[PDB]
Design a binder for these strands. Structure first.
Ligand SMILES: [Mg+2]
Ligand SMILES: [Mg+2]
Ligand SMILES: [Mg+2]
Ligand SMILES: [Mg+2]
Ligand SMILES: [Mg+2]
Ligand SMILES: [Mg+2]
Ligand SMILES: [Mg+2]
Ligand SMILES: [Mg+2]
Ligand SMILES: [Mg+2]
Ligand SMILES: [Mg+2]
Ligand SMILES: [Mg+2]
Ligand SMILES: [Mg+2]
Ligand SMILES: [Mg+2]
Ligand SMILES: [Mg+2]
Length: 71
RNA sequence: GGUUCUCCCCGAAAGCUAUUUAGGUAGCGCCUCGUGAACUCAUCUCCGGGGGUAGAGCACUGUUUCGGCAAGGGGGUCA
């Protein structure tokens, strides 16, 4: 009867909402520590960056060639 | 610098490694949630082990104080 309809158990998961008091658990720093590049807005680092060490996908040598006949 | 409602469960780290790196970041180490298997792990008993630290010692590496024998050396004496 329209108002009687409810979803399955565990279907909806609420979702994390950050910065909303202490009781919320997460709140004041939205689960992202104190300071550093990761805490800052637009933070983090690009994909495959090991902090100036030459990343795995450059220290290893490239190999082979893509065949046109294989496609 | 600041990041706003509430209860319940578990709960770190400030280490290694690398870095124009050192107040940053990454992988591992430590937290957590989830998913499966073996007596898997922990505590203590009685066995098997390797070590070369504490201590001790002076054959060796050097160092060191005495006493006994003593080549070899330092002072003297000749035609
Ligand atoms: Mg939550
Ligand atoms: Mg929470
Ligand atoms: Mg918390
Ligand atoms: Mg702050
Ligand atoms: Mg800090
Ligand atoms: Mg941080
Ligand atoms: Mg460099
Ligand atoms: Mg440190
Ligand atoms: Mg420490
Ligand atoms: Mg550092
Ligand atoms: Mg810095
Ligand atoms: Mg010692
Ligand atoms: Mg000793
Ligand atoms: Mg002694």
């Amino acid at each position: 009867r329209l108002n009687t309809l409810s979803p399955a158990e565990g279907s909806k998961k609420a979702g994390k909402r950050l910065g909303r008091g202490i009781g919320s658990g997460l709140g004041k720093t939205g689960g992202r520590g104190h300071k550093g590049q990761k805490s800052r807005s637009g933070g983090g680092v690009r994909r495959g960056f090991e902090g100036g060490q030459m990343p795995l996908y450059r220290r290893l040598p490239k190999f082979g060639f893509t065949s046109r006949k294989a496609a």
